[model samples]
Structure formats: C-alpha cells, structure tokens
Target: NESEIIERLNSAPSVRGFFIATVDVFNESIDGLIQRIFRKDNFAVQSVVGPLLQDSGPLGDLSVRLKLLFGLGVLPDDIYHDIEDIIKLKNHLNSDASDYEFTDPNILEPIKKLHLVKKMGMVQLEVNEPDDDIDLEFYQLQLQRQQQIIKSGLSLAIVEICNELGK
Candidate 1:
C-alpha cells in the first residue's frame, strides 16, 4: 500500500514542479548539467520555492517544502524517475563539481516562498469563509467556521482522490 501510494504521490504536478525547480538550481550549481536532464515545467517552480527573485538559499529549502505539497496530491501524473536519468544527471553534475561552494546559503528566500504559498493556500480549491466581518464576536465565530470549512474541504479532496485510486 505504501509503495502504491508513493507511486501515485510521486506523479503529482506539484511534485514534478518541485523536481523541475530543484533540477534548475542543480543545473546552475553544477554548471548547466541540468539542461541535459529533465524538461522544465511551466509552473515557475523556482519562484514558487523561494522568493520572487532567484536569490541565494532557495535551492535547499525546495526539498523540505515539497513533502507537504506532495502529501496532498490525489491524482497520478507523469514523473521522470528512471535510474539512467538520475545517474546521468548526478554524474554530469559530479563532473563539474568544484571545491568552491557557499556554506549556509541563506534559506531565507526559499523559506519566504514556502510561507507565501502556505499563507495563500491553494487556488480555485479554496473554500470561501464569507466576507470579513468587523464585529469582534462575529469575526471570531466566522474565523472558527472558516477553519472548519478549510479542514472539510481539504479532507474531502484527499478522500475523494484516495477513493478514486480504489483504496
């Protein structure tokens, strides 16, 4: 079941998006080795992973942040995980590896990107919480109700996907 789930999970567009973003960074750091690997997704993954600008530090944070997103995927999609593909990529990068490196490459930018996405949440899939209420008591109640709506929406989406997979 775990394998089945992992297989399905790996194919998500978000996962593909993250991978593309990682590969882009890997390309630059390893001296354009990535161009020979995966075709870039149109998701604008680099911007999504860190900040608006392709600053330092985002390259590493992309991996950690993907877990949460991939965990939410419900549909199986195309993914490039062939052994030959990965090995060739690693090998290409290794060939260009240099002693020069930046330690502590400022994860702030990528972390900022993660926070922005989390705060914005998912698009189109978002559950409305009604207009913002000014009254303190009403606002508090609405906030609670909105929280429930979000939970239900997310839970329902996941359940529907799982059920579709015949699990």
Candidate 2:
C-alpha cells in the first residue's frame, strides 16, 4: 500500500495532482494510525473510529486529525509542522485556478522546510556528482531531479510517519 501510493505520487501530472495525492496518502495513513489506537484499546473500530471519521464527524477534518495526533503525543513537533505545511499547500492548490509548478517560490519554500527534504539533501550530497554544463538539457535534467527529490522525500516522510504512529 505504501509503495502503491508512492508510485501514484510519482505519476502525478501537475502540482495540484501531486498535492491532492499527497493529502490522500496522508489521510489514509492517519486513518490507519487512528484505527491502530482503537484496536490497542480493544475496541471495535467500526463502532468508535468509524463514527468519528465519517463525513460530519469530528476527526473528519485533516487539521483536526493532525491536532489530535499531536495532542496524543504521537507526532513530533517538526513532523507536525511539515505535515501542516503540506496540508496548507494542498488547500492552496485546491482553491487556486492559476497554473502553478513545483518551481514556484511559494511551493518550493515550504517544501525546502520539510524534514525529509533536508535529510534527502544530505543523501544527495553524498552520492551526487558534479555537473559542469549549463544547457537546456541540463536545466531539464535539473527540473527532473528536483521533482524526483521532492517525490522521494515525501514518500519517505509518509513511511516514517506511518512507522511512528503504528508503533
């Protein structure tokens, strides 16, 4: 399921598509985490968790879910901040009609703040070789690389969150 979501993320066609997929993955992961919490209490998930996450229910909102998770001490501050930023970006994309790209400063700024992005940057530094040419192909390659890094970083972040909450 994790890999499947990541694959979907990779194939997303636009910034909006990518943000929606990211939010979907986060929603699913949060649902799973809450289910685990209910199971740990020996409660029937259908009776308790089900009602709370229904369309009109309290935990139905993404912001509420994140707040609850943080209140429960399951999400660390930095990860919470990163998820919050992603949710904000997704909400922005949902409302705005103007075409936007990942290269947009508004999008790029928050992404650069992501905890996983920082970690991925260190990994890239260790493995990536220098490229001297600055041509159209080079710029295209850089764009592709940037997208790859963001995708990979978000995937890793989701995986990490799932592991933490499922613990």
Query: Which candidate number has the best lDDT?
Result: 2
For model 2, where is the 10-residue window of minimal lDDT?
A: 122-131
| Cα displacement (Å) at residue 81, model 1 | 14
Decoy 1 TM-score against native: 0.24
Off by over 4 Å in 2: 39-49, 122-145
3-110: candidate 2 lDDT, tens digit per residue: 676687878888888888888877877777766765534358577767787769988887898898889988888778778888888998899889776655676767
lDDT of each: 0.33, 0.73
The estimated TM-scores of all candidates read 0.24, 0.76
Candidate 2 to native Cα RMSD, angstroms: 5.0
Model 1 residue runs over 4 Å out of place are: 1-75, 78-134
lDDT of 1 by residue, 7-120 (tens): 332343332232343344323332222222323445676445334223354333323223222344522321111212333433443565342111112211222223222343
Identify the candidate with maximal TM-score.
2
Worst-scoring 10-residue span by lDDT in model 1: 100-109
